[PDB]
Amino acid sequence: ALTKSQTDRLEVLLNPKDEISLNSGKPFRELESELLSRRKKDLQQIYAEERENYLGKLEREITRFFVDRGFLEIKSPILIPLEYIERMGIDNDTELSKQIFRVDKNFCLRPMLAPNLYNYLRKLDRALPDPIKIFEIGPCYRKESDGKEHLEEFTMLGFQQMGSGCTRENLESIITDFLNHLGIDFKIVGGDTLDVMHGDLELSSAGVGPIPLDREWGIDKPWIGAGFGLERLLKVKHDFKNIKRAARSESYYNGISTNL
Amino acid sequence: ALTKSQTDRLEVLLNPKDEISLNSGKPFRELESELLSRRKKDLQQIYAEERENYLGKLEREITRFFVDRGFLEIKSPILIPLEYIERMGIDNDTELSKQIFRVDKNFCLRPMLAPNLYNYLRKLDRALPDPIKIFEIGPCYRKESDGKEHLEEFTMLGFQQMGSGCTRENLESIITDFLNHLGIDFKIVGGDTLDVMHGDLELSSAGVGPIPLDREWGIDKPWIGAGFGLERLLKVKHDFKNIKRAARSESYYNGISTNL
Numbered sequence: 441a442l443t444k445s446q447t448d449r450l451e452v453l454l455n456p457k458d459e460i461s462l463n464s465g466k467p468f469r470e471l472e473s474e475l476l477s478r479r480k481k482d483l484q485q486i487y488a489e490e491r492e493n494y495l496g497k498l499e500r501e502i503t504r505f506f507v508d509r510g511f512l513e514i515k516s517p518i519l520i521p522l523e524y525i526e527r528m529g530i531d532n533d534t535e536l537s538k539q540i541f542r543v544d545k546n547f548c549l550r551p552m553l554a555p556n557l558y559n560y561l562r563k564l565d566r567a568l569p570d571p572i573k574i575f576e577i578g579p580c581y582r583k584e585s586d587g588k589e590h591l592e593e594f595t596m597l598g599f600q601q602m603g604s605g606c607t608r609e610n611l612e613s614i615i616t617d618f619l620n621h622l623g624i625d626f627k628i629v630g631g632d633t634l635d636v637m638h639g640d641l642e643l644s645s646a647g648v649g650p651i652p653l654d655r656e657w658g659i660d661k662p663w664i665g666a667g668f669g670l671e672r673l674l675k676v677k678h679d680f681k682n683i684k685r686a687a688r689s690e691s692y693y694n695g696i697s698t699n700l
Numbered sequence: 701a702l703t704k705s706q707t708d709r710l711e712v713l714l715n716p717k718d719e720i721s722l723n724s725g726k727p728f729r730e731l732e733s734e735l736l737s738r739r740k741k742d743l744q745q746i747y748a749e750e751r752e753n754y755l756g757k758l759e760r761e762i763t764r765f766f767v768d769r770g771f772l773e774i775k776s777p778i779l780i781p782l783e784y785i786e787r788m789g790i791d792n793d794t795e796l797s798k799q800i801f802r803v804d805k806n807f808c809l810r811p812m813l814a815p816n817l818y819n820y821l822r823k824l825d826r827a828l829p830d831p832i833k834i835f836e837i838g839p840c841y842r843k844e845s846d847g848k849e850h851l852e853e854f855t856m857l858g859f860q861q862m863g864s865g866c867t868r869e870n871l872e873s874i875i876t877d878f879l880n881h882l883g884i885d886f887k888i889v890g891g892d893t894l895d896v897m898h899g900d901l902e903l904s905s906a907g908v909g910p911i912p913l914d915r916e917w918g919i920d921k922p923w924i925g926a927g928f929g930l931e932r933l934l935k936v937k938h939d940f941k942n943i944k945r946a947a948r949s950e951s952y953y954n955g956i957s958t959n960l
């Protein structure tokens with residue numbers, strides 16, 4: 441009979457599409473040697489043929505999707521002023537105040553893209569024709585309790601449109617086209633606030649402005665937008681049981697264990 | 701006569717290929733209105749035609765270059781254990797100890813890619829055929845004195861090959877092909893340590909292993925590698941006078957000022 445620790449070891453080596461049962465009568469050492477062999481071949485194949493990282497390649501696919509649809513690709517600072525968090529309405533009554541990675545006296549790792557997107561919307565409105573369509577992909581940081589759905593270091597897609605055409609229908613059409621393009625099943629459940637759900641997993645929270653917070657950021661126009669976690673998308677796409685398989689990590693490469 | 705502050709304002713609005721002299725007899729207000737008009741059209745053009753961010757697009761070009769040459773694309777944690785810094789030999793006698801952005805009791809923002817690359821080399825050597833070729837592009841953080849060549853938040857390309865073919869000649873051929881592909885003039889000046897210089901600007905430091913540090917990381921094979929700052933590459937390519945034009949930023953979009 442396999443010990444719980446032995447079973448832990450084998451599941452780190454197991455692939456979702458693997459069709460091997462750790463409940464058969466085969467000893468640990470051979471089940472382990474079997475899976476080690478498969479995982480080395482998986483990496484050998486990636487090394488020989490494609491060589492692209494899941495998270496990098498997804499960011500590039502999401503980028504071409506939004507560029508082709510008219511959204512300006514933004515790359516803004518990850519290390520942001522702590523004041524941006526207060527100006528987002530994040531008091532201490534909210535959960536997210538406890539979750540901030542502080543850096544100096546006045547800085548933090550950004551837990552969200554909304555402050556920088558807001559700032560880009562305000563500035564670009566003096567130069568670009570209506571509507572203004574932007575998006576960003578990059579790291580975000582939140583302190584979290586251990587979760588199969590939460591990382592402390594993750595990657596956020598955020599997009600936002602300001603001005604004409606900022607309706608909920610249009611926002612749902614963007615979400616729908618986007619996840620149908622990626623091959624990710626979802627349901628949309630719900631100014632407006634809506635969530636994009638995969639079963640009980642939140643893929644995205646989206647929103648329809650104007651909202652009173654906009655005033656603090658110099659925004660006085662309608663808008664629509666959404667944020668998606670890239671690792672959650674990978675988790676669903678590749679059927680990973682734990683989101684750590686999809687993270688920036690030294691433990692996993694494209695969901696294959698690197699401890700062989 | 702233009703004040704120094706007025707001239708500061710105009711140079712923020714000026715483009716390297718702009719052919720306007722702030723030393724002519726035209727008043728501030730019209731020189732400013734002239735340049736505002738140009739910069740809005742530059743952004744309008746980007747918005748209408750291509751919409752890709754300089755830093756994102758360069759990362760994608762560098763990625764295809766190294767993937768096509770057989771290097772495995774790595775994305776490893778940006779937030780790393782503080783112990784990785786000591787194990788890199790970064791004592792307090794080195795400059796770099798003072799430059800670390802500490803995060804909790806035990807973490808920091810990575811100032812370099814070498815620890816994670818080292819860890820990937822060790823683990824992948826149990827699975828991949830010789831030679832092992834990896835690379836990574838992503839954020840790095842260092843506290844710096846105000847410089848026209850230094851950002852506190854920048855982007856590093858790092859690549860490393862381990863095993864056979866790890867000669868200085870091969871390392872220079874990779875560097876040479878890479879910068880000729882990008883259209884960036886350079887000179888290489890110099891186990892071995894070499895620098896890739898553009899005038900007095902350091903594009904890259906490279907190295908040839910084995911070196912005694914390798915032992916601490918579980919590496920006992922020869923290697924070659926180099927690190928390049930992406931913003932420095934953009935600075936040279938686009939002839940920016942100050943590296944802030946190329947940074948993750950809310951002040952500049954593809955080197956065009958966003959304060960119009």
Ligand SMILES: Nc1ncnc2c1ncn2[C@@H]1O[C@H](COP(=O)(O)OP(=O)(O)NP(=O)(O)O)[C@@H](O)[C@H]1O
Nearest residue numbers: 582584589590591594642643644645667668669672
């Ligand atoms: N810790 C995290 N790890 C991975 N993805 C995350 C994390 N926090 C947020 N996301 C993703 O970012 C999206 C937008 O952020 P947000 O709406 O603020 O998340 P949230 O409300 O905190 N979701 P949740 O914590 O699961 O209830 C989420 O829907 C997730 O896709």
Ligand SMILES: Nc1ncnc2c1ncn2[C@@H]1O[C@H](COP(=O)(O)OP(=O)(O)NP(=O)(O)O)[C@@H](O)[C@H]1O
Nearest residue numbers: 842844849850851854902903904905927928929932
């Ligand atoms: N603060 C920074 N801002 C931008 N690029 C940087 C920064 N620090 C390092 N780089 C880039 O990363 C490369 C590899 O890092 P490293 O060799 O450690 O730099 P370095 O020796 O500190 N160079 P320098 O500080 O200019 O004398 C450098 O050659 C630069 O291209």
Ligand SMILES: N[C@@H](Cc1cccc(Br)c1)C(=O)O
Nearest residue numbers: 552553554598647665666667
């Ligand atoms: N609140 C998260 C997700 C996000 C991003 C952009 C627009 C919208 Br609406 C929601 C964040 O600020 O990144």
Ligand SMILES: N[C@@H](Cc1cccc(Br)c1)C(=O)O
Nearest residue numbers: 812813814858907925926927
């Ligand atoms: N020292 C910097 C640059 C670098 C990266 C990889 C290999 C080599 Br050699 C140099 C860093 O560690 O990122």
Ligand SMILES: [Mg+2]
Nearest residue numbers: 535536582584
């Ligand atoms: Mg949360």
Ligand SMILES: [Mg+2]
Nearest residue numbers: 635642644645
């Ligand atoms: Mg939410």
Ligand SMILES: [Mg+2]
Nearest residue numbers: 795796842844
């Ligand atoms: Mg330095």
Ligand SMILES: [Mg+2]
Nearest residue numbers: 895902904905
């Ligand atoms: Mg150097």
